[PDB]
Amino acid sequence: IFHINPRLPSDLHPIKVVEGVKELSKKLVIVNGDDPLSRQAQENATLLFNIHLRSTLCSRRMAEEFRLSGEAFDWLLGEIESKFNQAIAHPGEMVGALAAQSLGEPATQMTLNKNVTLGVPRLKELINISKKPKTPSLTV
């Protein structure tokens, strides 16, 4: 969008990248509030995404392979914020019925009945607790 040629040197100070990714990491929130439990839950809720964000937007990669400019990096931070805030699950959503249908719709496509059982009978044998399985097995 910003017509960045990956041959010329950029004008992006890497400490601005570091404070930018730190500021973006702080600003996107899933568990809000200021409590020793709230900070822990917020850090754990976005831990994997924060590691991926720090890995992808690191100073060395962006100064070696991406070569973004300051305006491009600011737009990148804003767009990451916008997409993450759009991707948060909306309150009121019936994730239960949605989960049940999104599980049972991959049940009308596989077949029925040196391997253990698998398919619709395995699904029926899993969601029932099935005190007498047909082929129970270990993996030692």
Could you list the residues that contact other proteins (CB under 8 A)?
Answer: 1, 3, 5-7, 30-33, 41, 45, 64, 85-86, 88-114, 116, 118-120, 122-124, 126-131, 133, 136-140
The conformation of residue 90, written as its DSSP 8-state character, comes to P
Smallest distance from other proteins to CB 123, Å: 6
Phi, psi angle pair for 91, to nearest 5°: -65, 150
Residue 19 or 133: the one with the smaller Cβ distance to other proteins is 133
- Helices and strands in the chain: count of H runs, count of E runs: 7, 0
Residue 19 or 88: the one with the smaller Cβ distance to other proteins is 88
Residue 51 or 116: the one with the smaller Cβ distance to other proteins is 116
115 in Cβ contact with 102 (< 8 Å): no
What are the tokens at 122?
């395995």
